[PDB]
C-alpha cells in the first residue's frame, strides 16, 4: 500500500497472508475453510496465516494453516490476467473469533464513486522499496469504466475495475496482490495489477468479484 495509514492490529479480521517461505500475496477469508485470492498468486505449498498484524513478530493471535487445495478459475488467462481469481481450501477450518472473521460476498456490483477499503503488507513506496511490518489500509473510490479503459487502452476486460486516484500518490502495490477491496461490508475487489504503483493516470486494477459470486458459492459447497 502506497499513501496509506496503519489499519491497526486485527481491525481487518478477514485479511490473510499467503506464505511460501515469506509473505507474497494477500487473500480474504470468506468462511472458516476458504479464502479468496488472485490466480497469479498460485503456488504449490501455500501456508495461510490468519490473525496477523506484524508479520515478523508473533503477537499470539495468529493461526497458520496449510492450503489443502487451490482452485484457479477455469478461464484464468496469465497473459491478460483476465479471470484473476482463485479459491484456497484450508487443511483445517480456522477458529473464528474477534480477530479472525470472514467477509461477505456481494449481491450486486458496486458503482463508480463508491469508497472502498484496500489492505495489505505490500510496498509502500512508489519509487523504491519499503515493505512494512504491519498491515496498511487505504480508502479509495471505484473509478468509472471510461476512465479505467482510457488509462489502460486495450487492457481492461469486463472482469476488472479500476479504483484509486488519477492524480497518483495512493494505490496498492507489489505484495498486496490477492488482498481485499471491501465496499459497504462486501468483498467487491481482489488486488490484481497496475502499471507501476501510484503513478499518475495509472490506477490499480482489481478483479471484479460480483461477476463470480455464483462460481465461488458453487465451488465451495461442492469441494
Amino acid at each position: 500500500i502506497v499513501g496509506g495509514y496503519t489499519c491497526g492490529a486485527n481491525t481487518v479480521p478477514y485479511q490473510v497472508s499467503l506464505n511460501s517461505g515469506y509473505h507474497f500475496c494477500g487473500g480474504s477469508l470468506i468462511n472458516s475453510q476458504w479464502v479468496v485470492s488472485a490466480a497469479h498468486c498460485y503456488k504449490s505449498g501455500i501456508q495461510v496465516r490468519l490473525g496477523e498484524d506484524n508479520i515478523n513478530v508473533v503477537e499470539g493471535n495468529e493461526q497458520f494453516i496449510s492450503a489443502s487445495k487451490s482452485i484457479v478459475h477455469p478461464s484464468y488467462n496469465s497473459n491478460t490476467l483476465n479471470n484473476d481469481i482463485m479459491l484456497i481450501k484450508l487443511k483445517s477450518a480456522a477458529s473464528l473469533n474477534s480477530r479472525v472473521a470472514s467477509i461477505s460476498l456481494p449481491t450486486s456490483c458496486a458503482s463508480a464513486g463508491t469508497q472502498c477499503l484496500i489492505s495489505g503488507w505490500g510496498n509502500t513506496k512508489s519509487s523504491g522499496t519499503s515493505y512494512p511490518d504491519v498491515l496498511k489500509c487505504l480508502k479509495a473510490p471505484i473509478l468509472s469504466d471510461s476512465s479505467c479503459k482510457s488509462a489502460y487502452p486495450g487492457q481492461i476486460t469486463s472482469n476488472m475495475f479500476c479504483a484509486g486516484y488519477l492524480e497518483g500518490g495512493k494505490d496498492s502495490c507489489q505484495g498486496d496482490s490477492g488482498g481485499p477491496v471491501v465496499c459497504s461490508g462486501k468483498l467487491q475487489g481482489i488486488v490484481s495489477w497496475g502499471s507501476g504503483c501510484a503513478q499518475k493516470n495509472k490506477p490499480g486494477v482489481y478483479t471484479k468479484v460480483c461477476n463470480y459470486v455464483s462460481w465461488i458459492k458453487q465451488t465451495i459447497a461442492s469441494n
Binding site: 497469479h40 523504491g128 522499496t129 507489489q174 505484495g175 496482490s177 488486488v191 495489477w193 497496475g194 507501476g196
Partner: peptide, 29 residues
Amino acid sequence: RVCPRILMECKKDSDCLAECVCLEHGYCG
C-alpha cells in the same frame, strides 16, 4: 505495462511475471 502485484524476488527481468521488471533491490515491480 501489465505487472501483477505479487511480491516476487528476482535477479533478472526475465525472472518476473508479465510485464513486470526486476528492480534495484531484487524484487519485481
